[PDB]
Design a binder for this molecule. Sequence first.
Ligand SMILES: CC(=O)N[C@H]1[C@H](O[C@@H]2[C@H](O)[C@@H](O)[C@H](O[C@H]3[C@H](O)[C@@H](O)[C@H](O)O[C@@H]3CO)O[C@@H]2CO)O[C@H](CO)[C@H](O)[C@@H]1O[C@@H]1O[C@H](CO)[C@H](O)[C@H](O)[C@H]1O
Ligand SMILES: CC(=O)N[C@H]1[C@H](O[C@@H]2[C@H](O)[C@@H](O)[C@H](O[C@H]3[C@H](O)[C@@H](O)[C@H](O)O[C@@H]3CO)O[C@@H]2CO)O[C@H](CO)[C@H](O)[C@@H]1O[C@@H]1O[C@H](CO)[C@H](O)[C@H](O)[C@H]1O
Lengths: 131, 125
Amino acid sequence: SHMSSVTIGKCYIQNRENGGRAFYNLGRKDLGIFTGKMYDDQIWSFQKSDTPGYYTIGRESKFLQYNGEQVIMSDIEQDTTLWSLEEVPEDKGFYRLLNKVHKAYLDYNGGDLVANKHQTESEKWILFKAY
Amino acid sequence: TIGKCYIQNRENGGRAFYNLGRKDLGIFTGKMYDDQIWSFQKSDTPGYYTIGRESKFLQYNGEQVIMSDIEQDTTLWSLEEVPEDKGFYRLLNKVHKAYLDYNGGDLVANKHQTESEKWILFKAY
Ligand SMILES: CC(=O)N[C@H]1[C@H](O[C@@H]2[C@H](O)[C@@H](O)[C@H](O[C@H]3[C@H](O)[C@@H](O)[C@H](O)O[C@@H]3CO)O[C@@H]2CO)O[C@H](CO)[C@H](O)[C@@H]1O[C@@H]1O[C@H](CO)[C@H](O)[C@H](O)[C@H]1O
Ligand SMILES: CC(=O)N[C@H]1[C@H](O[C@@H]2[C@H](O)[C@@H](O)[C@H](O[C@H]3[C@H](O)[C@@H](O)[C@H](O)O[C@@H]3CO)O[C@@H]2CO)O[C@H](CO)[C@H](O)[C@@H]1O[C@@H]1O[C@H](CO)[C@H](O)[C@H](O)[C@H]1O
């Protein structure tokens, strides 16, 4: 309990397969991926968690979470907000983001963020410095 | 900021690319193909940078944005910070004082400052 994390940097989280960026808009309660204009709500806090080798992904004082059913934003840092970076051997600079609890990779379907246990081509992300 | 990078436009998320086999220079929305990885290097002229792909250098000839086989004066670009958008720069051609811009799938240049000229250059790997 009482997990903590420390912000490492601010970054965009962009998909290799469609160039789309993960975003979270608090006012619309909207979490998704968008492929056009770059907006401020596509900037995330990348955080070293208190658990070795695992990171959290934050926006608007919340944390990116996979609960076994959907990808959502959590008000509290839970074990299900821990992600590891799995380098993609064939695509230097890209990572899969693997949920610790559920061993599911961050993916997308249409405009939605999802998670998948099988490795696929739309699970490859580049997390680049926003500033 | 130096070395291999992607060069991505704020307004539409498109990335500059150059494909030697197709002789195709432009901007592209969609998948992040390897012909979108540029070499951003300090030039021989202090204060300016070259934007390199396929062993060639991005230039503006006064009419069109094209590649150059050699590092000539028209291949020199400066980074001009965008005051209102942290992390973004305009790319200003030294010889012609024209900013790198886009129109559809074309790279173009414009001496006016506009909203289509804001780029983020991020590390490729
Ligand atoms: C006004 C708005 O919601 N803009 C969002 C932006 O929305 C994009 C896109 O602009 C919009 O056209 C699209 O709408 C789709 C619609 O939802 C579907 O029902 C329909 O079938 O198809 C439409 C076209 O696809 O939704 C998109 C998002 O899915 O999304 C970006 C994402 O970065 C922003 O969230 C933007 O909102 C602005 O964000 C600002 C962030 O600094 C600020 O909070 C603005 O106030 C806010 O309007
Ligand atoms: C199939 C192809 O050439 N894909 C390119 C991609 O091309 C884009 C766009 O997808 C394509 O529809 C467009 O085609 C235009 C055509 O070139 C014109 O001659 C025609 O008159 O009008 C067409 C419609 O506009 O060209 C676009 C580029 O100008 O562009 C991307 C840029 O990153 C790639 O180059 C992609 O080809 C891929 O390149 C990879 C290497 O980077 C790899 O070799 C892939 O196998 C290859 O498919």
